[PDB]
Assembly symmetry: D2
Homo-oligomer: 404 residues x 4
């Protein structure tokens, strides 16, 4: 079955009534008829007992995301941040190191700096490229972390070669696939990534409504080489990793996704491939039409022939994707543009509305200047997350704003 | 205003339309009209930008819980577990120690063992009593953690004397007030606790519906003595602690409560004092009527005159409270009782339905035998969370089950 | 089982997972595996096919309301208004007459005037008292409609004697039991009413949140005497009436209650008896303390010894109930009182907040002056729907306002 | 702005916080600070007082549907059925006649037969074609009712010529635009229809989730000629019609849409044009590929060159649309096909899943045989509502089923 097919069918429960959709299990606990039945659900983890460990509505969304990313197993949690955090928490010990791409989401850098520091972990930031990664490896490296498309630098890493290196070094390649849109734009596991994390808040939801995140992994022998699975590997084989994300992330840290949120995210997936296709058509149109404009200092879009991302885009992404950036030259010209444009400015991505933001003063404002510049963030840069609006209507609004 | 008054009025928003209740802000992002407006909301944290940091619906529930616990500030998160974890994460550094009561919730022990170990922290478990705590203090102690009512041991710590000791040692007294029912049964901050954490899933919700948790703190000078607030103390004074729970727990770890869950929890608080009063009336009735029964080896209920908890209950709790336990003598007699009783068995508390559970095989099954016994869990023990049903109907069901 | 017991247990589904609560079936349609299976669900109405006819979440709320009102069958619909309308639509033909109490809810009078006029029906308004009803009967009378407690006149009809008369005349006694709080304060079916309708929006919900209504009926031979059940009586016996409310109200007019609303109403019932008891305790306290105040021209409360409603209250209601009125003497004094009182003014009832309103200018403003006066509405009258707040806090706010 | 643009922007509230989306006003009542403020909101209908009359969440969905259908005003209600019923209730008096197309939705025929009969109205059924309509006019005709695309006969009426005739006769042309997908496939008001009604449950929702309906009208002088607007026309001009649908449908009959449902429908509109385009691309592909198959007796699809609907489709619809039918020849061959096909059978339309149904035994089973045949329903007929799945995957499932 094709992605569009799986997206409306995968994960639908076998409802006793024939229900064509997903009931919302907004219930905290599940009862049992005897001491023994209770004892067996607690011992084996089968059946339900309490919603913080698992819930049938979240399970449907896991099964659908599993089908769409082509994974072994998915675990959903309260947000994208919670998923990045739970995945790393399940991998790492005090004294470990991570080798992380430089271009990362500002809260991933914040989480790495302020929380993984507390778990005793050090991070080395590098260009997400095999040789730079190689030369950062040490005896203590336990994970290589990159994003499918750097945001906002819009660089696409060579995933397959990074996965071969990670596999050869005995470490996990963890890919933040937030920009790959739950597999609709990219499926990093298919190229050899061991773990994907992502914010479902973005493209998967599609409506800038509620928060969710996911961790997914693939069948691999890697986890045999992590001591925490030697104290699970025998019992669970490659499922030992997602079971520990579950245990640590949900049972213990309690980062549980509401079944109301699971239900909305489950439905947003039904149109993700259609939406991402439309946004990316429009983004390529806007890229082509705006790149030669005199007031546009630089336009980055991975599907432009001469773009730096175009090589790796053509291999890993289904299209040029839904994001582009403009450099207006400086703060002053960005300001006038954003003040003039009759489109929303907000810090979200993958909404059905086209959204513009100034990373230097918002998404990346909690970082020092050097760190902004290293992430491809400059004072002229404006990021555009393209929505579902008519491409001619959008171009007219851009043109008009540029007149200001 | 009295608690019952505050519970239906506190935290109601000033709605532009006059709305008597709480709209659900199921929106991810908040837009701005200029580069500069965006930049100012990011710099100052005022106004809204993105739902993972804050949301008007969660804010209403914080303001109500603040009023009800009599706190300086509340922060809500995705679950009780997330709140215990975020509070400790905001307090602790690798190498710190915690001194924790022995009787604790099994997932709090699990979180301490499996996650706080990863943050480099060691825990010393003691009887929650001033001298045992005193003699456990070391140069590295950074927190004393107890529960308002030990579950299921039903012992009530001497909070005021523990708070005086913590204050004198320069460490935080953190109280899990899950059993104090959002201030309706106990307000630990009023006795000098620095921090309360709690599961709103339980009594506050009242319907065994959705998960939520809260962290609250009081005005105190203690945080001046924690280095992390010296790198905040000047800018924020006693609000530095809840601001860091927010930052670490929500911004970074992303343990965000859904606005659908906030809305349901906000409403459950409107009846918590009424429900807790009814449950506790009924629990005292069942305690009195069952304690002399020949098949009941031991009945614990804090409001029974000769109960070990009765001293500290009379001081700290509004009543004997909604929980009691029976010891049937052994596994075999517990089994027959639970199989025979025409009441639900499930692992939840503070639901409107009376719930029974066998801690030895469920809530405490992930602990070694010694740890079960030290928590007051034995193979004969059955815990009862008393709901809203008629007390005579309930007694008849107990009597009848005991015949088996 | 007692009412409080039934309210947390009745209508809980037999969930395949043991769920202790009610999943929300927010699904439009239910599928089938063969042409024949589809054909059989359509023929027999068994199983599910489409949410406008029936839905498992609404069914749970029907079963609980059935248990609580002590009915044969309940049907839920989108609002209290929809239920009054559907019930009458299932009873009446063009040319029929209704004999209706004078004191009625303003929208019931509006529905009777503006919509039942369109269905060809005439209404005779009378004092809700056996002899006045008797003398209004004609060959064309098809229903006697009264409210359990007139609002705001606070008169309680002699239900048992009205039901004996209706039964003797061969016509339905239809009781709006909105004030009887889903059976917690009154159960009209138990006294011989054939049909109850009510707004669940009010006391049953308890949180001034979402709209719902219900129609319920009892086992009776009456429907054999209505021709529409002779074209059903044989097949369904006393269930012919609720089946037709379903068919006309839901299948055809499509007045369907959302499963999100059913879920919230199902939970509000879990505390209705506790809330109604508390409100009514407080209302009796406020009645007693305010009735002798010099600025209070008249105070009506059914549980006051000398009140006109007290006779019939003592027989039919569980207590004096949660509503009282004050007459300030005139418009000018009502105005100052309501402007001065630090309590909410809004047009809703049975919320957890005490609510005040001026019927002459609001709830009854769409009626001519004569009709207001006949409903017990005067320019001095203020209606109080007592909430869950502390009674001393409330009395202080009243006293203080009266100073103005 | 183009339809796709309006669909993500129209109706977004001016939120005090900048919220990019729609808060859910799950609140029953709106308070006021003085007797006078209350009195003025009741007199003028401005501002809010009680959710049965209006609610900010429903208002956003009305404003968006207004923009998308290009209407004067929209009113939302609990279901498609409620909207058809409320619209006619606002138009008609006892003794009026309606002239209605023969091919109609089975519940519209049921509503006409079983409920409009109770309002004293007679219906004449005709081919939805100017001359047949003309010759059915009488002095008593008050409305001509047709559906944008007959279901399942798939005939498209000549709307513009029907609107010219209705306008010339002084009667309303009421169009059920359920198949025109909230204006994405057809906008009947743009061709001169006076009133549109539709089920938002179908294409607008897009997820087979919750029920909603809408009534919309256009600026017209027609309502001056209806006596009920002469007792409103002066005060409100063409808005007198939607104000009366509101008053009768919502204030009085209480057919109110839940704000949870409004919120889900508001979001489903954001992708309706994209979804309808994809479904209709796929439907045309399946039409073309299946029409020559030997086991397919007849295939109807409006976008096939020689189809009977193709003339009027090319004028009124944006494409061939998302529905097609197959005639398998008889009951026995339909049965084998439907039993064999690995696609869902359910009675819903415009879901993201492709749905098949056998109208003779389901959607039209409550009609006599003659009425089925007159609606284009035969024992061989299978209706397909095309979803979002891959067209090659779908064709393979059809081909395979036809082998059976
Ligand atoms: C937004 C985002 C996240 C975080 O997800 P939330 O649900 O917002 O926590 C993580 N990674 C990337 C690339 C993101 O864009
Ligand atoms: C249930 C419970 C928790 C955890 O809360 P969740 O919302 O269930 O995580 C924490 N402490 C105590 C005492 C509890 O009983
Ligand atoms: C409020 C009320 C109604 C109507 O119910 P809604 O859900 O508001 O339509 C009907 N009867 C009485 C007495 C009411 O008070
Ligand atoms: C389904 C449908 C309706 C009714 O809408 P509900 O929301 O299901 O009542 C009305 N007209 C047509 C053509 C329909 O298909």
């Amino acid at each position: 079955m094709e992605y569009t097919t799986l997206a409306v069918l995968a994960g639908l429960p076998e409802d006793p009534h024939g229900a064509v959709g997903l009931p919302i299990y907004a219930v905290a606990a599940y009862g049992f008829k005897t001491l023994e039945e209770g004892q067996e659900r607690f011992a084996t983890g089968e059946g339900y007992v309490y919603a913080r460990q698992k819930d049938p509505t979240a399970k449907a969304l896991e099964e659908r995301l599993k089908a769409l990313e082509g994974a072994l197993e998915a675990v959903v949690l309260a947000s994208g941040q919670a998923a990045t955090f739970a995945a790393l928490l399940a991998l790492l010990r005090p004294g470990d190191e991570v080798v992380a791409a430089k271009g990362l989401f500002g809260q991933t850098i914040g989480l790495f700096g302020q929380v993984l520091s507390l778990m005793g972990v050090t991070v080395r930031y590098v260009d997400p490229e095999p040789e730079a990664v190689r030369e950062a490896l040490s005896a203590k490296t336990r994970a290589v972390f990159v994003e499918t498309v750097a945001n906002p630098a819009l660089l696409v890493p060579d995933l397959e070669a990074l996965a071969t290196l990670a596999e050869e070094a005995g470490v996990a390649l963890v890919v933040d696939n937030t920009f790959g849109a739950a597999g609709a734009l990219c499926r990093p596991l298919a190229w050899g990534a061991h773990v994907v994390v992502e914010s479902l808040t973005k493209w998967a939801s599609g409506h800038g409504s509620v928060l969710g995140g996911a961790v997914l992994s693939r069948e691999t022998e890697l986890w045999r080489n992590y001591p925490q699975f030697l104290q699970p590997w025998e019992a669970l084989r490659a499922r030992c990793f997602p079971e520990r994300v579950r245990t640590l992330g949900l049972s213990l840290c309690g980062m549980a996704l509401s079944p109301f949120n699971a239900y909305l995210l489950f439905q947003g997936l039904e149109t993700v491939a259609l939406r991402v296709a439309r946004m990316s058509e429009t983004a390529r149109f806007l890229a082509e039409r705006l790149q030669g404009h005199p007031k546009v200092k630089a336009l980055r879009y991975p599907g432009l022939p001469e773009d730096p991302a175009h090589r790796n885009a053509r291999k890993y992404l289904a299209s040029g994707g839904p994001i582009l950036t403009l450099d207006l030259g400086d703060l002053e010209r960005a300001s006038r543009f954003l003040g003039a444009i009759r489109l929303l400015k907000a810090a979200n991505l993958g909404d059905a509305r086209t959204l513009l933001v100034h990373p230097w003063t918002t998404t990346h404002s909690r970082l020092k200047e050097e760190a902004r510049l290293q992430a491809g963030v400059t004072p002229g840069l404006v990021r555009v997350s393209v929505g579902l609006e008519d491409p001619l209507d959008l171009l007219a609004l851009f043109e008009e704003a540029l007149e200001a």
